[PDB]
Amino acid sequence: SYSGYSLNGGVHPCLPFYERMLQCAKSEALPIKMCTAQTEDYLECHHRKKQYALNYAIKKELNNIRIVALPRYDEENDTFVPFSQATADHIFQ
């Protein structure tokens, strides 16, 4: 069964989606066709297929030559500065 607990006794991360899916299934007269959104959200939170597809696409893009240098992160101001600009915290300096 779906206990709904985490691995430290907390709450399973899928519990909101599972509750929504069960509520929709109970309420709808045609749960299979009318709860597609909730069921897909639950299945996504469970399997993470879409994130794996995104990671696969990102790996292919990284293999392709399009990115040279990402902007540095100024943590003091919580901003992003272009890699071209020189900063004290910069690795190369």
Partner 1 sequence: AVRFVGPLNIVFAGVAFLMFYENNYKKLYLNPRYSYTMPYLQSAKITKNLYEKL
Partner 2 sequence: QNNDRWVYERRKSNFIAQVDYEYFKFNHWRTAWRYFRNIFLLTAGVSFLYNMELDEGLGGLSLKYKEFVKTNPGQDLLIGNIRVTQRPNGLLVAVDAH
Partner 3 sequence: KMNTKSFEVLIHSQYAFDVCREQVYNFEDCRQTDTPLPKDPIHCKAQAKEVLSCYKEAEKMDPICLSSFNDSRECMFKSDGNLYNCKTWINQYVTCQKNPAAFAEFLEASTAEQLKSKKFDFVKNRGHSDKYL
CB 17 within 8 A of CB 38: yes
What span, in angstroms and rounded, lies between the C-alpha atoms of 60 and 54? Answer: 10
Is 71 a binder of partner 3 (CB under 8 A)?
no
Buried b (16+ CB within 10 A) or exposed e, 31-40: beeebeebbe
Is 81 a binder of partner 2 (CB under 8 A)?
yes
Q: Of the two residues 43 and 81, which places its CB atom closer to partner 2 in the complex?
A: 81
Give the H or E element holding residue 45: helix 36-47
Residue 70 interacts, among partner 2, partner 1, partner 3, none and using kind-specific CB cut-offs from 5 to 8 Å, with partner 2
Q: Of the two residues 15 and 25, which places its CB atom closer to partner 3 in the complex?
A: 15
Residues that bind partner 3 (CB under 8 A): 10-11, 13, 15-16, 75-76, 78
